[model samples]
Target: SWEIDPKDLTFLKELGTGQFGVVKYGKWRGQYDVAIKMIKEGSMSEDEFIEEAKVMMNLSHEKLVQLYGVCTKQRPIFIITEYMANGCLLNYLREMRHRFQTQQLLEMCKDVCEAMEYLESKQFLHRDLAARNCLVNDQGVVKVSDFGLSRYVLDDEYTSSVGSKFPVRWSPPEVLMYSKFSSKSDIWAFGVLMWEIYSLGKMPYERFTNSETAEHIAQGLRLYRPHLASEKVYTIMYSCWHEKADERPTFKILLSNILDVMDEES
Candidate 1:
């Protein structure tokens, strides 16, 4: 077993904790700031650990959180990434809700679309993309995080099947029915995230259980974006949630249309 010596690493306060591991704000080589996620020893076998590392290692984009490196030593494995100063997208939206102009919202959506486009082009499907998984930097640049559930779409495999339990509100109708997922499913998730940003972090149904919400969405009930949302924003959200997967725009097209919409709004 390998180990990261204390002298080689600087341990800082816990940045965050989740089922996967604990993230610590730390420095390596005394120069670069990094977020070190320490996975508990025995938390995952070496094979699972290597698989996750391999999946994350290939990702790179401005709008997607980049994996800087890793430290596997002793019992715990550490995955390092760039630290986001502003935390998750939900936190930023809540803190700055009153200050966000329509233009700002459009820009935020564009950032998300850009990130998704990058991922999709690489044939990666981010199965759990949501507001909480999106991070913002001090400069307001958005980056998609939480790739632990990401998967590669294969031609012969079914993306999803009927009776799937995807995030009901965030999932498209096809995904709800366990239909094959594609970039379209990702588009649907993006729409929900847009709504989340517009609503300033309001949950789809404050009290509904995941199962209840899934049933509703499966029955054709959709969560519309707020009327207060700008026409362009609403249009994009609606387009992303189109009932038919084929009707949804690819991330590349979404990006172009977003620019057009923003320019018109401005």
Candidate 2:
């Protein structure tokens, strides 16, 4: 297993960093600009890296980030992808607070649902789907990113014994108690993401510590719907947070719901 020679890649600038790896803007083959995500050696075992790469490469959806290729066999595992000029949805929304209209917000959420439906078709769950994980280009198009915690639905033995702890405010009641994760759990996270988008990227627990947020969620509390959200947005969000996972609608249903609401708003 030989990784791509560093000589074939040129570093441009840093894009962003997270707990697992750092993303950089770089030029490949002296032609196109791309975002390169390099994972530190031993950050994840060889098997784990390969598994993640396989899933990302196989996923093909307009709303999902494209994985151009990978470079292994080096100090840092590199993943090259299409350059997203607007950066992560979180930063983008934060910069444009109160500038979005109802239609614009609905369109953004539609992009997200399209991505989720694609994932559902693959029977894979993006266990972590937050604003930071959604990237948008200059065209105002959104794509899902950061599949580090993704898992296949058929793999029952796979489970998260420990919660991410942070961002628990966005988590649902069942997920907090380690209930079997399903598309519904993803929907719960989606509601939080919706809130983030509407509130200009302010996370629900921005002022509270992870512990406090976790306690609040475990006690059946959720971040209140933002005042800026329309009644239709609230209705869709309410269905996502239904206490019973089975009661929650499928991604397909959610997509339709969003569309119907958009039409009504129009």
Against the true structure, whose TM-score is highest?
2
lDDT of 2 by residue, 156-196 (tens): 32334344434456567777677567788888888778778
Q: Write model 1 residue lDDT over 143-186, tens digit each, in one string.
A: 88875453322322223433343455567766666556677888
Best by lDDT: 2
lDDT of every predicted structure (CA atoms): 0.73, 0.76
| Model 1: residues with Cα > 4 Å off, grouped in runs | 1-7, 40-46, 96-98, 148-166
Measured by TM-score, how close is model 2 to the native structure?
A: 0.87
lDDT of 2 at 65: 84
List pairs with backbone clashes in candidate 1.
2-73, 2-74, 161-178, 162-177, 162-178
TM-score of each: 0.84, 0.87
